[PDB]
Design a protein around this nucleic acid. Structure first.
Ligand SMILES: [Mg+2]
Ligand SMILES: [Mg+2]
Ligand SMILES: [Mg+2]
Ligand SMILES: [Mg+2]
Ligand SMILES: [Mg+2]
Ligand SMILES: [Mg+2]
Ligand SMILES: [Mg+2]
Ligand SMILES: [Mg+2]
Ligand SMILES: [Mg+2]
Ligand SMILES: [Mg+2]
Ligand SMILES: [Mg+2]
Ligand SMILES: [Mg+2]
Ligand SMILES: [Mg+2]
Ligand SMILES: [Mg+2]
Ligand SMILES: [Mg+2]
Ligand SMILES: [Mg+2]
Ligand SMILES: [Mg+2]
Ligand SMILES: [Mg+2]
Ligand SMILES: [Mg+2]
Ligand SMILES: [Mg+2]
Ligand SMILES: [Mg+2]
Ligand SMILES: [Mg+2]
Ligand SMILES: [Mg+2]
Ligand SMILES: [Mg+2]
Ligand SMILES: [Mg+2]
Ligand SMILES: [Mg+2]
Ligand SMILES: [Mg+2]
Lengths: 110, 288, 97, 85, 87, 75, 245, 95
RNA sequence: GAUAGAAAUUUUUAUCCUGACGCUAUAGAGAUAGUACCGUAAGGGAAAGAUGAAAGAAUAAAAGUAAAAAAAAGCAAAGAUUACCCCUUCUACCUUUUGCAUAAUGGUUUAACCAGAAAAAAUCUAACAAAGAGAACUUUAGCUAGAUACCCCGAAACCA
């Protein structure tokens, strides 16, 4: 895969924002996709169970869990349900937060 | 990094001796033995089912079968011969130029869209190429040369506004194949055949400057194209004055599959050598 | 249910003999080796079964279509018959229909 | 087990060995090649490609010979290439 | 123990016996020859001029191509009768 | 002479002495030296039958070499 | 120094470079190892997966048993349906019967062959290596030039370095292995000597110590790292590609 | 249904499903309403409307139909001009 | 209807490198053999070996019995007891049925044999992800892989 062309202007027309020159000090990190996209996806089970998966996370995910659920709680009035997989390096959350989590990981610049 | 690492200093060797697959990976099979799952083994009692013969799937027990009461209809009728065109949104296109998969600099036809893995064509399945849609219409900032098999008005518009040139070109099943996975066609080691002309019904679509059809009269190109701007309300750029002009101008023969090559040729990729016929009948054949 | 009276000589097996030490050696050959040869070619076996898998019906119908005309008369016969039986049984029987 | 060679080829390698090996080569050659006998009983369609009337597309079309048995007496006279159907 | 020699795919041109009875007929075809040129073809010692159609093949391809695929001008004229008849 | 009998075996035919020519001989003429069409089937089977016995003779002897070499660690 | 870019948030690893000529030359040097190969998150899950996939996918079991169709004879009802006053049977080759057929059992040559997907096997070698390193039992070497063809030297070397019982020695190619290595090791059970084209998970776990040559590591690091950055193949990779061999 | 073919080993499809139905990509199966060409004069205009319709098949029928139908009719399709392409996706479905 | 089912057009690298998550005397070939034996015939068709270097050295565990015949009462046991019974308390077991102690079926007993196979869709675990698959395909979170599934015996007939 081509390393994507450095531009003068960010974000780009299609909305692509590069991760920063430094990385934050938060005790966890998110590898961008092999496409340099933020590894947040949506997935369903049994057709009715809606889920949101954060991927490729290196560090204490527990912290990431804290921060994510604390970001989402004002939105739903209540903590959203969470499943942490420590060996997978993966986070899972009930409902579709795809759009908002995309933004929230553009915030911290992962 | 992964503090898990430092937990492995503590523990005994990882070897074959100690291995557990991920819990819930193997959902264990059961076997009709024992008090629970033996004795009729979940096959029920007597009747048909216990003997394993219950009738075929569409069957209602002789009442006229659901799927068979309903009258036939033209539906999937001639489904094999109905042309398909794989869609390409403008949003996806902007995307692909943005991450520099397909670069706008050199010309863009299907092949390039393919190699960036931005689109997938299965010609055997009656796919006659990529077609264009307007999804990122407002999003679209890129100046590009695009050649597709079909496009929609709004799409043509959104490329014009930015100053690129869109051409509607056709490919037959065979030539289209050659187009999409070209390297394996070369390794086939057969000459590079003539391009077909589009079928009769399709003819009017490709003869219109309306679509900027590759077989259309260039005399109407500047006309209908400028028309596009008055309808959609923008100032039409002067392409002839641009630096990238000579690439945007670049066309194919209606007989040419690729850029820079010609019917009749043969590629030897071992010797990195092109081969052209010096025989006359051949040249009359492939150049016609 | 009468069971063996005398202990057998304990079979001693070196797991360090050649074949076991060298197990699975070239497995990654395509990957590590800039793929030219596929893991398939590490499969030494019956002509029709190399780098392939299937249930009984598929196996059989395969052996037929590949080596069929090189088979003996009788085996061949039994093969066509096994085929028929299987046709009938997979299609036409089951609980699950 | 299997045979080293398929049995359809047993009648040919039957010929490669033994006395057939000293046979005149021209003979064996006129024997090898089987030209397809003239259509007599079945009537052929001309083209390789023929349009489907129902479906409306060009269709690859091939011609299958019809089996014709010859009683032994057929070989005694001249039947002009035909026989029993 | 030292391991076996790694299995290698021989990169040389490879030609079966044309006269061996057991050898498959799919490896004895013209196309296989063409393919073999494509692979190496310098070293494969394939006659280059053979990678193009014969005079027979040529005139037949010609015959069928002019048969089922008319002229652009001719197709436009095929369409004018239709459009005007429907008008 | 080498001849081929009705059973599809190829046999060595020991000759005999007769006071008269063979085409004038009853008993000789009603002997058939040749194979008929159907016999061709059995011929194959014979081969096959025979072909197995060799096949599994070999496979036995090979076995007898493993056993010995694991019973007697020479060298 | 590593021949390949590390991701910005991740520092490389370093391993002693040991050499093989003296017993007593332990750390002859220092090597930076790539974090994305030798520091990867350890997953025994995939170790397991691929370890099995190694075991099985080669497996063809030839075990045939004969169905009531394939047994010798008994093409007939042994006695009549009615009046005998014993249990009714078809052929004496009914599976019920003594010398008769086998109901289900094994069938024929039977293969288990399946392809673990690409990037999986890849990440498996990755993990295996990471683990051999993190459990401290990986030893990088330069050279591999051996002082002599006496195998006792080698065994005693492993003895002086507390290398544990078994060892897998990895070299770059089949042709380039020096003659003393080949000599001394080919007469050894526990030690093994292999081109890095045949590095494999099963063997990695089968030997209590892994030993890697420097050209070998520079090679591996690359060949594996290729795969997080790679497209989905269009056609087989053995074919011509723009960048690719 | 033929769950395993003879020559290919594959799973065959019923054709008489296909001639009278249509599968969207959502999984909704579409059909004619029976008897619509049948005894028209005898029928009220209302009925005639109700018949000339295209209608949807309940879950049972759909699943059934899928079983008699291979992968190839379940694939995604972009036809030029397609009257039904407008329809293939599900919108606003909250379950 | 049940089902049947193509081709054009594409793909395929050498030999070398043999074995065995095959059986172990009811298994494994029918086979110690097409032998005995059974059929007028075509045809059917068995069962069985075991000490040790040397015979140019003479475990006591299946049913069944014996050592030891039985003592008012009754699904045979159980609760028990100082004590075997004596006391008290419980309608064999399977299949099959609305319902069986049933006087409905099956079985002398022991041993060895003797019957649930499939991956469309689905879930579960995982890789990578607007993509994924070691070619061909599928995609509006998806593709890919893995793991999860559908028995045994029997007619009268029928055709050659
Ligand atoms: Mg999903
Ligand atoms: Mg039960
Ligand atoms: Mg029952
Ligand atoms: Mg009932
Ligand atoms: Mg498609
Ligand atoms: Mg099976
Ligand atoms: Mg029989
Ligand atoms: Mg019979
Ligand atoms: Mg019967
Ligand atoms: Mg027996
Ligand atoms: Mg047996
Ligand atoms: Mg062998
Ligand atoms: Mg036996
Ligand atoms: Mg006893
Ligand atoms: Mg009592
Ligand atoms: Mg009662
Ligand atoms: Mg009753
Ligand atoms: Mg009742
Ligand atoms: Mg009663
Ligand atoms: Mg009674
Ligand atoms: Mg009764
Ligand atoms: Mg009773
Ligand atoms: Mg009864
Ligand atoms: Mg009963
Ligand atoms: Mg009784
Ligand atoms: Mg599936
Ligand atoms: Mg099962």
């Amino acid at each position: 895969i081509p390393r994507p062309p450095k531009h003068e202007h960010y974000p780009t027309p299609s909305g692509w924002q590069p991760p920063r020159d430094p990385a934050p000090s938060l005790p966890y990190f998110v590898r961008r996709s092999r496409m340099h996209n933020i590894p947040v996806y949506r997935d369903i089970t049994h057709g009715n169970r809606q889920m949101t998966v954060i991927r490729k996370v290196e560090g204490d995910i527990w912290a990431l869990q804290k921060d994510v659920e604390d970001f989402l709680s004002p939105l739903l009035g209540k903590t959203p349900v969470t499943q942490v997989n420590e060996v997978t390096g993966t986070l899972r959350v009930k409902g579709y937060f795809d759009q908002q989590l995309k933004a929230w990981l553009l915030e911290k610049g992962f | 990094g992964p503090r898990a690492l430092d937990l492995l200093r503590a523990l005994p060797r990882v070897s074959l001796a100690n291995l557990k697959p991920n819990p819930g990976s193997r959902k264990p099979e059961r076997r009709p033995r024992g008090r629970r799952r033996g004795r009729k083994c979940g096959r029920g009692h007597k009747g048909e089912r216990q003997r394993g013969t219950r009738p075929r799937l569409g069957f209602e027990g002789g009442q006229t079968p659901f799927y068979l009461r309903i009258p036939k209809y033209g539906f999937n009728e001639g489904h094999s011969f109905r042309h398909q065109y794989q869609p390409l949104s403008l949003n996806r296109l902007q995307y692909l130029i943005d991450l520099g998969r397909v670069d706008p600099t050199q010309p863009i036809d299907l092949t390039q869209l393919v190699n960036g893995r931005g689109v997938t064509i299965q010609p055997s399945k009656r796919d006659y190429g990529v077609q264009l849609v307007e999804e990122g219409a407002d999003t679209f900032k890129a100046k590009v040369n695009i050649e597709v098999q079909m496009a929609s008005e709004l799409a043509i518009a959104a490329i014009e506004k930015n100053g690129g040139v869109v051409t509607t070109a056709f490919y037959d099943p065979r030539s289209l194949e050659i187009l999409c996975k070209p390297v394996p066609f070369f390794l086939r080691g057969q000459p590079i055949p003539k391009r077909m002309l589009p079928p009769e019904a399709l003819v009017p679509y490709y003869t219109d400057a309306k679509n900027r059809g590759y077989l259309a009269d260039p005399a109407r190109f500047p006309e209908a194209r400028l028309e596009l701007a008055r309808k959609y309300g923008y100032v039409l750029p002067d392409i002839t004055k641009d630096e990238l002009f000579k690439m945007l101008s670049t066309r194919k023969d209606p007989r040419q599959i690729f850029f820079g090559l010609a019917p009749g040729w043969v590629v030897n990729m071992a010797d990195k050598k092109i081969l052209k016929p010096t025989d006359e009948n051949l040249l009359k054949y492939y150049s016609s | 249910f009468h069971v063996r009276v005398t202990l057998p000589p304990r079979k001693v097996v070196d797991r360090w003999n050649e074949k076991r030490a060298m197990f699975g050696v070239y497995d990654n050959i395509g990957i590590l080796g800039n793929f030219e040869k596929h893991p398939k070619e590490l499969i030494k076996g019956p002509i029709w079964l190399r780098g392939w898998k299937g249930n009984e019906l598929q196996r059989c119908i395969r052996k037929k279509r590949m080596v069929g005309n090189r088979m003996f008369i009788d085996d061949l016969h039994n093969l066509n018959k096994r085929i028929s039986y299987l046709y009938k049984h997979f299609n036409r029987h089951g609980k699950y229909r | 087990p299997l045979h080293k060679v398929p049995v359809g080829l047993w009648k040919q390698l039957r010929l490669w060995e033994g006395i057939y090996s000293r046979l005149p080569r021209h003979y064996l050659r006129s024997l090898e090649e089987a030209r397809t006998p003239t259509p007599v009983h079945y009537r052929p369609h001309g083209a390789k490609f023929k349009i489907n009337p129902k479906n409306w597309q060009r269709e690859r079309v091939e011609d299958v010979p019809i089996p014709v048995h010859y009683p032994p007496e057929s070989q005694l006279g001249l039947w002009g290439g035909e026989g029993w159907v | 123990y030292r391991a076996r020699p790694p299995p290698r795919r021989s990169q040389e041109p490879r030609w079966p016996d044309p006269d061996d009875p057991l050898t498959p007929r799919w490896q004895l075809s013209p196309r296989y020859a063409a393919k073999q040129f494509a692979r190496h073809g310098a070293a494969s010692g394939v006659a280059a001029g053979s990678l193009w159609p014969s005079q027979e093949q040529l005139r037949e391809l010609e015959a069928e191509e002019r048969e089922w695929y008319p002229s652009l001008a001719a197709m436009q004229e095929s369409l004018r009768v239709q459009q005007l008849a429907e008008e | 002479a080498w001849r081929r009998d009705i059973f599809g075996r190829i046999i060595w035919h020991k000759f005999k002495q007769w006071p008269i020519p063979w085409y004038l001989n009853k008993k000789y003429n009603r002997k058939r030296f040749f194979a008929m069409p159907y016999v061709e089937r059995f011929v194959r089977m014979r081969i096959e039958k025979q072909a197995r016995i060799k096949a599994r003779k070999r496979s036995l002897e090979r076995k007898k070499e493993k056993f010995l070499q694991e019973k007697f660690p020479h060298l | 120094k590593c021949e390949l870019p590390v991701p910005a948030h991740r520092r490389p690893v370093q391993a002693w470079i040991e050499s093989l000529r003296g017993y007593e030359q332990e750390r002859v040097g220092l090597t930076e190892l790539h974090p994305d190969v030798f520091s990867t998150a350890p997953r025994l899950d995939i170790l397991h997966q691929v370890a099995i996939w190694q075991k099985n996918f080669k497996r063809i079991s030839y075990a045939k048993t004969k169905t009531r169709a394939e047994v010798r004879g008994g093409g007939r009802k042994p006695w009549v349906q009615k009046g005998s006053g014993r249990a009714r049977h078809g052929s004496i080759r009914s599976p019920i019967w003594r010398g008769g057929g086998v109901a289900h059992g094994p069938r024929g040559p039977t293969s288990y062959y399946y392809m673990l997907p690409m990037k999986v096997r890849v990440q498996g070698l990755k993990v295996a290596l990471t683990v051999k390193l993190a459990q401290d039992d990986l030893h990088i070497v330069d050279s591999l030039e051996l002082p002599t063809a006496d195998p006792q030297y080698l065994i005693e070397l492993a003895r002086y370095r507390r290398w544990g019982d078994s060892v897998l020695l990895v070299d770059l190619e089949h042709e380039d292995m020096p003659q003393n290595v080949v000599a001394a090791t080919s007469g050894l059970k526990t030690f093994n000597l292999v081109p890095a084209v045949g590095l494999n998970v099963h063997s990695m776990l089968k030997h209590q110590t892994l030993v890697l040559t420097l050209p070998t590591v520079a090679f591996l690091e690359e060949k594996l790292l290729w795969h997080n950055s790679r497209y989905t193949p269009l056609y087989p990779f053995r074919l011509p590609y723009c960048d690719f061999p | 249904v033929t769950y395993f073919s003879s020559r290919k080993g594959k799973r065959k499809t019923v054709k008489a499903v296909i001639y009278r139905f249509l599968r969207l990509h959502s999984g909704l199966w579409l059909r004619r309403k029976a008897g619509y060409k049948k005894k028209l004069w005898k029928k009220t205009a209302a009925r005639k409307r109700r018949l000339r319709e295209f209608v949807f098949c309940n879950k049972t029928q759909s699943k059934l139909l899928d079983k008699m139908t291979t992968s190839f009719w379940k694939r995604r399709n972009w036809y030029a001009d397609d009257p039904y392409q407008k329809y293939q996706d599900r919108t606003n479905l909250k379950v």
